Amino acid sequence: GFFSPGIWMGLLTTLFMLFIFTYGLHMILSLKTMDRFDDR
Amino acid sequence: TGLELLYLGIFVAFWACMIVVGICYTIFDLGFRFDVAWFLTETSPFMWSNLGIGLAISLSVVGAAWGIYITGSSIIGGGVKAPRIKTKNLVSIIFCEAVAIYGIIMAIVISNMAEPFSATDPKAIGHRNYHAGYSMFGAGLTVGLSNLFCGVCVGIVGSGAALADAQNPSLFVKILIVEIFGSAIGLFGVIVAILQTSRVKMG
Amino acid sequence: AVWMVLRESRILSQKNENEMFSMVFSGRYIILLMGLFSIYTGLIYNDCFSKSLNIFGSSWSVRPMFTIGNWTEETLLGSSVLQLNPAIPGVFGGPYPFGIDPIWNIATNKLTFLNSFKMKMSVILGIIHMLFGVSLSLFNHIYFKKPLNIYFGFIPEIIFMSSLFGYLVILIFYKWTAYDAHSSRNAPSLLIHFINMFLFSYPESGNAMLYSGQKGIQCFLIVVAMLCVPWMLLFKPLILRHQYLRKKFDFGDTMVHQAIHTIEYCLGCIS
Amino acid sequence: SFFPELYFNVDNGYLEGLVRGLKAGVLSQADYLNLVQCETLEDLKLHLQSTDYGNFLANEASPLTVSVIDDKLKEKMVVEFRHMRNHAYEPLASFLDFITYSYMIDNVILLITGTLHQRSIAELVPKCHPLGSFEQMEAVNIAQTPAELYNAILVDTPLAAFFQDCISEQDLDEMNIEIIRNTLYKAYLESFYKFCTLLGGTTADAMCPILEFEADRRAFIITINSFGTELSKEDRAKLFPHCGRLYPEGLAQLARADDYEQVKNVADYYPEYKLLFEGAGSNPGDKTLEDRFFEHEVKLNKLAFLNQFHFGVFYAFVKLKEQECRNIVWIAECIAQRHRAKIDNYIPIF
Amino acid sequence: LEYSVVFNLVLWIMTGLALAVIITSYNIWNMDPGYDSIIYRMT
Amino acid sequence: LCCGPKLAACGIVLSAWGVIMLIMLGIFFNVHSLIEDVPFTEKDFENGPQNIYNLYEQVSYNCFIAAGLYLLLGGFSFCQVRLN
Amino acid sequence: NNPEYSSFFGVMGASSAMVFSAMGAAYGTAKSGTGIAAMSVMRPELIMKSIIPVVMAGIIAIYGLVVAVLIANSLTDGITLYRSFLQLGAGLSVGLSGLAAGFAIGIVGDAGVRGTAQQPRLFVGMILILIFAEVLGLYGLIVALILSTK
Amino acid sequence: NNPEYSSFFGVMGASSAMVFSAMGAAYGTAKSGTGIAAMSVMRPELIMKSIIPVVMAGIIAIYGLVVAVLIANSLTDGITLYRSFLQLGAGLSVGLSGLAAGFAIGIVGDAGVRGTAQQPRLFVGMILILIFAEVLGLYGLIVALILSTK
Amino acid sequence: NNPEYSSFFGVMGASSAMVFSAMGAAYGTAKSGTGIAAMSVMRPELIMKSIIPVVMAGIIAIYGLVVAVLIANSLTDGITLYRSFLQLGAGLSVGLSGLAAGFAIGIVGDAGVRGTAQQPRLFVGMILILIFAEVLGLYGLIVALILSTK
Amino acid sequence: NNPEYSSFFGVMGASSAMVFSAMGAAYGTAKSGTGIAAMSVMRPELIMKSIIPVVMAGIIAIYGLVVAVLIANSLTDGITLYRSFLQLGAGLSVGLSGLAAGFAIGIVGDAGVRGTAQQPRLFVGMILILIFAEVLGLYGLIVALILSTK
Amino acid sequence: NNPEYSSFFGVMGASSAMVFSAMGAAYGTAKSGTGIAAMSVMRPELIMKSIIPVVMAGIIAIYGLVVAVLIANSLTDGITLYRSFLQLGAGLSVGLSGLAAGFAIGIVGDAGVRGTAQQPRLFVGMILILIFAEVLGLYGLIVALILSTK
Amino acid sequence: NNPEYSSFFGVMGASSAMVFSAMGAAYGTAKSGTGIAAMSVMRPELIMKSIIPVVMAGIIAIYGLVVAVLIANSLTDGITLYRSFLQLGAGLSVGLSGLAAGFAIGIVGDAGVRGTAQQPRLFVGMILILIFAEVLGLYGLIVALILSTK
Amino acid sequence: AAGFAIGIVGDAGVRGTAQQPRLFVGMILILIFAEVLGLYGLIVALILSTK
């Protein structure tokens, strides 16, 4: 067979972590800094 | 849209491959090699249960937290000209905390049911354990997502309430009614999650 | 349409700001005929709100004889089945006097009997109208004294269309009268022979032929249709060039115009 | 769609609350009435102190004039705008830049003309509208050389992309300055409109109607004003933006029109405009066509604050504040000249 | 024998590597030169 | 009530069409007591031809009843057009 | 006998019903609340009338509750599988249909409130439209109930 | 004699028919309601005519309800599989076709309602386009009805 | 000796023929209606002769209906699979081909009607262009008809 | 007797608990530092107070450190799987919860810093809102801890 | 008795720790250097203080270098797999945690360094915040060290 | 006794070490070169100093070249698999770490050269920042060497 | 990777060179570096393909 119980379950838990990581990293990448400061 | 394009391309390729593989298994008349029962039965009920528990708590926090930032920014911003806002409109964040609580209580009641099996061959073993396992997953998922979207709703509404109240203090009380409906949405998810695990057993 | 005509004097002698009514009114005499012919064809189609018109002339089958033909208490099994009425049982047959026998309006397989008719009929009628339209061009080319448009145009054009498409129409009628249910198994397929005709595909077996010698006919007609193309394709510009040098004419542009006519004509005939 | 109401408040949450809080401070009808019931500039000051306005004429010259009130009103809103513009992130800042572009365009028209008629940049800059800013050099110390200003614009000035229509300097010398500025503004409208449609959520639906209105308004007014001047019908059409409701069909008729009546006949096909031309009684002692357009534009900018998750609130804010200034100055001017019967020509901004 | 292991490994290893290359290649392919300094004048 | 003569006129035409079709349908039911073959037979169907004849007469009656309603409607709508 | 895993699909049904209905109600509610707050700044007198869209959304939430509860109470271990598929279908049918309905509730209520703020005569019209969205959700409930008891 | 899970394909049909039809009607309803709310401010007298796209949408929803129920009533455990695929096909055919119809209703209503306000003569043309969309929805129902009894 | 699942391929063909063809017609209808509505503001007298793109879009949907009926009537239990693949190809061929035609009819119709508004002479040209788009649908039907009888 | 791979799920929990919590705190830190840098220019006297969101972000990171260490010290070779999934749940539970809480910290703090500088009366409200986020994070810890003994 | 291919996970750990930490430091370095290049042109006297963000980024890279080496020196052929899962966890824990810290370093560095030139009193605030980012990275190292020897 | 396919990993390592590091150096080279061209027009006097980032990027590519060759000269048919995994890890370690360094090099070079054009005092600070990117690349090389010889 | 390097630097280099003739030498050097980067690939392939 292509997959075992072990491999398959491992894939499922990996995906949950990838989904959370992807969300977290996505929000981290979408972070900007200021072009200029308001005043002295 | 560079990231959205990446996400879509993966999404399409993911399912496109499943379509080709699935139809091929049919076309080449494979002996039920793609066995869903096998996938569901070999996967330990412990995995399903603990996933639902983590989701129930984690998704509910995501919702609450989502709403927290929605109304937090609106409240803080508006307050620059209307400092009165903090007197009443902070209740929206109390609503979000209540949304988070929903998931916490449910998650604990579910986790309290977790037991060892000392089981091996699923054949005629743990028949009830599989039912209870899947149920725990579902109930956890049910309440988690329900609280997730509840928290977002109440956040969006609370923002509008703060923006309205900033300009007219008479509007807050009437508008608050909408946030109460939002909270009910989360509670409904709780009711079902309770029912789904109301009659489960381990061992 | 009758209403509009009966009120014609009142509709004209008033204001009609609604352009939708004005349009159909202007075409009211067109619509009148549309209805009258729609009645004629609807009666032959024998469909009036999905209802047939039974004139007590429906003799397609004699159900009493169905039971005679080795169907004893079939209505017991029938409780879960339909059972198709056989052809050539020796007791069924005979055309309906006018239109489709009403019996088909209550059949579960009308979706093959009636759909087959309409497909084949549509082809027959379309091709005939096409041939008529071409025939009219002969009168116009004669009126304007353009011998070239008939010696190099009409003649190969009408042969092209007739040899390919009129042949098909003949075969459709041929099968209807040539083959009965007695040969329904491995009955010739008109579409397959038509396609194999053009492709010069003549398998030894797998498809029954409509008539002996058909292979020779199929090849002949396609070759002639292809030989018709040079006539319409190149003979007019070539002879015009000759007439130029003999009499003493944009030869290149003329070839373009004639080539476009030929290409569009032949491909359009198919489409 | 689900495009707004989710990521919007992450960066723009603060500003959205702030800008609507600022809107809350706009003069109401009750406040304008208190300002009208003055007939004295000093009393006007006192009544202004009742609102978010006031105490800004303090420490100024003892004699109070209209020109001072005008400058101060602009200054106040410029600071508020720049404050929000500076505390902002690219997703919104680019939108806000378009708003500033409208003012920069006018300012660069001032930089040319003067450069073309040997005037020093230092003499021109003091009369530029705020928000142009132009902190960059090369546009400065051009040595009254048109080529140096032309290169400085292409390189440092954000409007460089728009000047692609008017190029090679030849255009600067041979084209009328007004055709040059109308051409550049058209380029602005076309890019800005498309930008709003790229942000194809609430902003597009709340914002585009206003931009489409401006495009159609300018097409109408230009056609009318162009009647009595020297301008080819084709060159006039060249200035008609394509971001509006007249573009499919309508501009062709205005381009051919040679009369006010023909322009109205076009409006007759668009009830949203027909009502404005009918309302513009244009009597010798009534409101005119420009006045009705201003009333409509404000209506639209007020409706912008019916959506809580878009960029159109910031655009509307600026326009509403500018009209607020126009209203206040009009009152100050009517007092100074004592034309009390014409005081009720301000545009209510709620 | 152990197909499921070699299969699982090779698929996901080459998938991760291939995607890293695709994304990295895209980012360079679409490198933003700034379209300033000299580009405005050459345009 | 007027209700608008444009709407009364529609009812008159629909009512006339209805009576014509419904009466003809009831006749066909009585004559072929049939192509439609939808008299709502029982599932416990016996060898009793009289049972389907009875159903067909019932359906025919129902068609004439419905026609009577259109006959009444046509009268009402007609008078509305006359007074309108 | 009763096969294993058969209850899996029924559990997904009970979850799907509630989750998708909550999605619809949550979107429709947030959209209505946004529009309501936007209106009340301009004029508070219409606030009470503008609440109905929010109740409309909540009904979508109930639609999901009725089936999710019906299934959740019906779920056991010894399920004949056929019944589990019926439960799965009932869950999806009401949830996804209610979701679509709740979306319409959101869009129509939000636009309706802004329109009504400008035109009070819009009140009846927008409510009538909301009725169709509620009917769309009900249709979901109807099919789901028929399947779950089949 | 019958295989297991044979009802799986059929039950998805009953759900799919209702869900896709609700999605179509909901889309058309939401888009139409947006146009109605925006238009009615300027032309309130049209409020009772601009509602029609919304009714059109509800028809698509009924189309779906009818097939989904018919499948449910014919949905059994001892299905011959052949029949099950037919039920799924009937469900998908009407649902997805109604979804396409709902899209057209949505776009045509949105543009049509505003276009009518600027041009009362457009009303009849708008209706005809809507009738074409209703015919598009019917086509799916027709095929589903043929399959469900085949 | 008949392979299981053979009927799945078959019924999916009949469905696809209808679904994709309806999608094509729906797209062309939606775009045509949008252009017509906008056109009607200036040139209402052209509304009636501007429906053509919409009618043509419809026949694309019919072409799909025709094949779907032919397959649905041809479906049986003991399908030899070969026939099923011919039905599947016939379904996809007409559906996807008509879908492509739907885009051409829609896009061309929009541009044609809007242009006609200013240049009434474009009418014959609009028709010539649209005919070719209809032909695309016809070609798809032709192949589907050949396959279903092969 | 120990299912192989049983240790895989356990260690994954410890990893998630730390990584996701660090991501959350880092997100909040980045937003807070950005807002502080902009604020402090005009009112440097507020720099010290403005750090609070960042310290708070840091709590979200500790929350994760506590679980990640608790799990790591609870790993063995002969893990009975049951225990491993309990540890995995604890890891995921605190991870996502801390991540969401860190986002709320960052987003709210960013706005709060600007709001306070403009109106110091908002300082307390800023703290109260962020205090909820810190509780949200504690919640995550509490459940993650509870699972360790079940 | 030892599982085959067991070394794979530990090897991926050693590399992952180095790569992700370099990714974090690289991002923080690039953003900090950008702020330095943009800032110090106006105030070069700060050029020797704005470098700190960059040095701190390097710490995250070392964090990773130390663990990656510790893991590599812990690998053999006959690994009991258990140890490999521990090595993978330690690798990812420090790598991904340092990665998150790198973003905090980079974003805060840019905002802080440019802000400092505008307001020199910000220097202390910038360092404190960046110190918190270093603390966030260290937490990952702590867990990685606990796992790598467990 | 050697696992078949085992050589696959080591071969991919030798390639990855070169391919990813080449992309990194390519980014740095391309990004820096663009800034150089802009600088030189304003002032060509720095053209012989602004090249430094470019050669630095090349060193990163060499880092990868060294490992790729070391792995390639360490490939065999009768590979013990363990060594093959180490070679794969080493290839990724140096390649991906050099890749991160390449971006670090490119971004700071472009900003540094453009800034230095305006402020010559930036040169010294620029060099140090480039040094950090080179060190980041070296760290990957170090681990890759440790793994490949382990 | 080398191809991308060549294209990006060529565009900026050629455009700049017209603006600044002194850029020619620097452009060539940068182009040379990209070509050297490409060669590295060839070197590994020759060593590896012959192993």
UniProtKB/Swiss-Prot annotation, chain A:
- PTM entry text: N-glycosylated.
Protein's UniProt name: V-type proton ATPase subunit S1
Domain of life, per lineage? Eukaryota
Q: Where is the protein found, in the record's own terms?
A: Endoplasmic reticulum membrane; Endoplasmic reticulum-Golgi intermediate compartment membrane; Cytoplasmic vesicle, Secretory vesicle, Synaptic vesicle membrane; Cytoplasmic vesicle, Clathrin-coated vesicle membrane
According to the record's subunit comment, the protein's assembly and interactions are: Accessory component of the multisubunit proton-transporting vacuolar (V)-ATPase protein pump. Interacts (via N-terminus) with ATP6AP2 (via N-terminus). Interacts with RNASEK. Interacts with TMEM106B (via C-terminus).
| Tissue specificity | Expressed in brain (at protein level).
Role played: Accessory subunit of the proton-transporting vacuolar (V)-ATPase protein pump, which is required for luminal acidification of secretory vesicles. Guides the V-type ATPase into specialized subcellular compartments, such as neuroendocrine regulated secretory vesicles or the ruffled border of the osteoclast, thereby regulating its activity. Involved in membrane trafficking and Ca(2+)-dependent membrane fusion. May play a role in the assembly of the V-type ATPase complex.
Transmembrane domains' residue ranges: 1-21
Family to which this protein belongs: Belongs to the vacuolar ATPase subunit S1 family.
Tell me the residue ranges located in the Cytoplasmic compartment per UniProt: 22-40
UniProtKB/Swiss-Prot annotation, chain C:
Please list the residue ranges that the record places on the Vacuolar side of the membrane.
53-116, 176-220
Sections of the chain in a coiled coil: none
Q: Which residues cross the membrane?
A: 23-52, 117-136, 155-175, 221-240
Subcellular locations according to the entry: Cytoplasmic vesicle, Clathrin-coated vesicle membrane; Cytoplasmic vesicle, Secretory vesicle, Synaptic vesicle membrane; Melanosome
Entry's family note: Belongs to the V-ATPase 116 kDa subunit family.
**What does the UniProt record say this protein does?**
Subunit of the V0 complex of vacuolar(H+)-ATPase (V-ATPase), a multisubunit enzyme composed of a peripheral complex (V1) that hydrolyzes ATP and a membrane integral complex (V0) that translocates protons. V-ATPase is responsible for the acidification of various organelles, such as lysosomes, endosomes, the trans-Golgi network, and secretory granules, including synaptic vesicles. In certain cell types, can be exported to the plasma membrane, where it is involved in the acidification of the extracellular environment. Required for assembly and activity of the vacuolar ATPase.
Protein's recorded name: V-type proton ATPase 116 kDa subunit a 1
Give the organism, scientific name: Rattus norvegicus (Rat)
* Organism lineage: Eukaryota, Metazoa, Chordata, Craniata, Vertebrata
Instruction: Give the gene that encodes this protein.
Output: Atp6v0a1
Q: Which residues of the full protein are shown?
A: 420 to 734 of 838
Curated annotation (Swiss-Prot), chain E:
Residue ranges, Cytoplasmic side: 24-43
Superkingdom as given in the UniProt entry? Eukaryota
TM ranges are 3-23
Question: In its UniProt entry, what is this protein called?
Answer: Renin receptor cytoplasmic fragment
- Region of the whole protein represented: 301 to 343 of 350
Curated annotation (Swiss-Prot), chains G, H, I, J, K, L:
Its record classes its membrane topology as: Multi-pass membrane protein
Q: State the Gene3D superfamilies in the record.
A: lithium bound rotor ring of v- atpase
Q: How is it modified after translation?
A: Ubiquitinated by RNF182, leading to its degradation via the ubiquitin-proteasome pathway.
A Gene Ontology biological process annotation? synaptic vesicle lumen acidification
Q: Which residues cross the membrane?
A: 6-28, 51-71, 88-109, 127-147
Q: State whether keyword Membrane applies.
A: yes
Q: Topological domains (Lumenal): residue ranges?
A: 72-87, 148-150
| One MF annotation (Gene Ontology) recorded for this entry | proton-transporting ATPase activity, rotational mechanism
Residue(s) at site: Essential for proton translocation:
E134
Q: Where in the cell is it found?
A: Cytoplasmic vesicle, Clathrin-coated vesicle membrane; Cytoplasmic vesicle, Secretory vesicle, Synaptic vesicle membrane
Any one Pfam family here would be ATP-synt_C
Q: Which residues are on the Cytoplasmic side of the membrane?
A: 29-50, 110-126
One Gene Ontology cellular component annotation held by this UniProt entry: membrane
Tissues/organs with expression: Expressed in brain (at protein level).
What InterPro entries does the database record attribute to this sequence? ATPase_proteolipid_c-like_dom (IPR002379), ATPase_proteolipid_csu (IPR000245), ATPase_proteolipid_su_C_euk (IPR011555), F/V-ATP_Csub_sf (IPR035921)
Its biological purpose: Proton-conducting pore forming subunit of the V0 complex of vacuolar(H+)-ATPase (V-ATPase), a multisubunit enzyme composed of a peripheral complex (V1) that hydrolyzes ATP and a membrane integral complex (V0) that translocates protons. V-ATPase is responsible for acidifying and maintaining the pH of intracellular compartments and in some cell types, is targeted to the plasma membrane, where it is responsible for acidifying the extracellular environment.
> PANTHER family this protein is in?
V-TYPE PROTON ATPASE PROTEOLIPID SUBUNIT
Record-stated family:
Belongs to the V-ATPase proteolipid subunit family.
Q: What is this protein called?
A: V-type proton ATPase 16 kDa proteolipid subunit c
